[PDB]
From a paper:
Anthozoan chromoproteins are highly pigmented, diversely coloured and readily produced in recombinant expression systems. Here, high-resolution X-ray crystal structures of four open-source chromoproteins, gfasPurple, amilCP, spisPink and eforRed, are presented. Like GFP, chromoprotein monomers have a β-barrel structure that contains a chromophore, which is autocatalytically constructed from adjacent X–tyrosine–glycine residues encoded within the protein sequence itself.
Of the four structures described in this work, the overall chromophore-binding site in spisPink is the most divergent from the others. The most striking difference is that Ser65 in gfasPurple, amilCP and eforRed, which forms a trans-peptide bond with N3 of the imidazolinone ring, is replaced by Phe69, adding considerable steric bulk in this region. The increased steric interactions displace the imidazolinone ring in spisPink relative to the same position in other chromoproteins, promoting the unusual twist in the tyrosyl moiety for its accommodation in the consequently smaller cavity.
Numbering used by the authors:
A (entry chain A): 6 to 65, 69 to 224
B (entry chain D): 8 to 65, 69 to 224
The structure:
């Protein structure tokens, strides 16, 4: 196994949203084969953020998924060499972002590095007014194509006052020269945000993700 | 709805300025989530575009639901349900459709107006190089008495290629009904050609609901 039953992780995310630069650093622990992970994050530059931390939380780790033995796990098979992915994030109100993530392995630690560029968020929208309340669970479609996995998801961001904001993710997960691909499948996931202060400089995230094929 | 129902379809529209009409008749088992129909292009045929782009718009009351999840689409009957749909292909082809589903005796009546445009002249849709839709799962999200349907579906293309499509659906029951929680509906839609000219087709679908266990 390139990945052990328990792994440590680190995150470094740099970017800008509506021209506001920021840096987030994190450390965590996860169980790759159980599909569980958690981490503690700090906004080390540009905090308190003028935008909802929720917009970067799903971009803060695809090798943490529970797969049945009869479905190849592209994200773990990518290790030890690692995986890089690009991501398009599009909200229904015109807010958008593009991110590039590199996942690498250093001993017992999985290293996650991201550059996140966001723009066109409405000034009075829930993201810039920080009126969000975490993401509703959803299912990511995983479609193999030309040695990459295309991830496609519709995810709703919860908003204060019983409202929601729809978001579409288009992900392209690229391992180096893969020779085994899974069939098309889905990965169900729940991402929970825990605030660690009142100011918005520290957060904890937890995720559970599990793969399945449709029975149709 | 009875265990077995008859259905009729009337779809009128235009794609890249080309007008067409499709009529169909079929039978299904609403509670088993199974349906099939035979379709004929009665005006504007042979179509200059792939029949596959209208096939997912040709019937939400045919879904297998477990007893502990309310079935919005069946609870909408006998009053019926109307929905709007946005269809967006990754190459810029797009369509908007409005579907009215009604009940008249033992027959479910499906009426659609489908407007499509901006399909690339050399793309798989206008070159009729498609091979049916890959199965997928539709997200169903209740919102103020309606169900928002959201799906990413891949259309198979000759030569081992695909064309991604996004559907954004708004299902509106004609009378308020008990609402389900957010869930997904897995489905497989199969097309079978009934002729060589492209005037007749058979479609079949199996759809089954699931709540996530996360």
């Amino acid at each position: 196994q390139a990945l052990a039953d328990t792994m440590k992780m680190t995150w470094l995310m740099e970017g800008s949203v509506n021209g506001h630069a920021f840096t987030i650093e994190g450390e965590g622990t996860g169980k790759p084969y159980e599909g569980k992970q958690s981490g503690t994050f700090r906004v080390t530059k540009g905090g308190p953020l003028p935008f909802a931390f929720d917009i970067v939380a799903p971009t803060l780790f695809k090798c943490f998924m529970k797969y049945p033995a009869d479905i190849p796990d592209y994200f773990k098979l990518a290790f030890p060499e690692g995986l890089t992915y690009d991501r398009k994030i599009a909200f229904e109100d015109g807010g958008c972002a593009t991110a590039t993530v590199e996942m690498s392995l250093k001993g017992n630690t999985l290293v996650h590095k991201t550059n996140f560029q966001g723009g066109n968020f409405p000034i009075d929208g829930p993201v810039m007014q920080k009126r969000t309340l975490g993401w509703e669970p959803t299912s990511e479609k995983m479609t193999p194509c030309d040695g990459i996995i295309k991830g496609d998801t519709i995810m709703y961001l919860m908003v204060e006052g019983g409202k929601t904001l729809k978001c579409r993710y288009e992900n392209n997960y690229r391992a180096n020269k893969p020779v085994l691909m899974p069939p098309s499948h889905f990965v169900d996931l729940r991402l929970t945000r825990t605030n660690l202060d009142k100011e918005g400089l520290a957060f904890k995230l937890e995720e559970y993700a599990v793969a399945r094929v449709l029975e149709v």
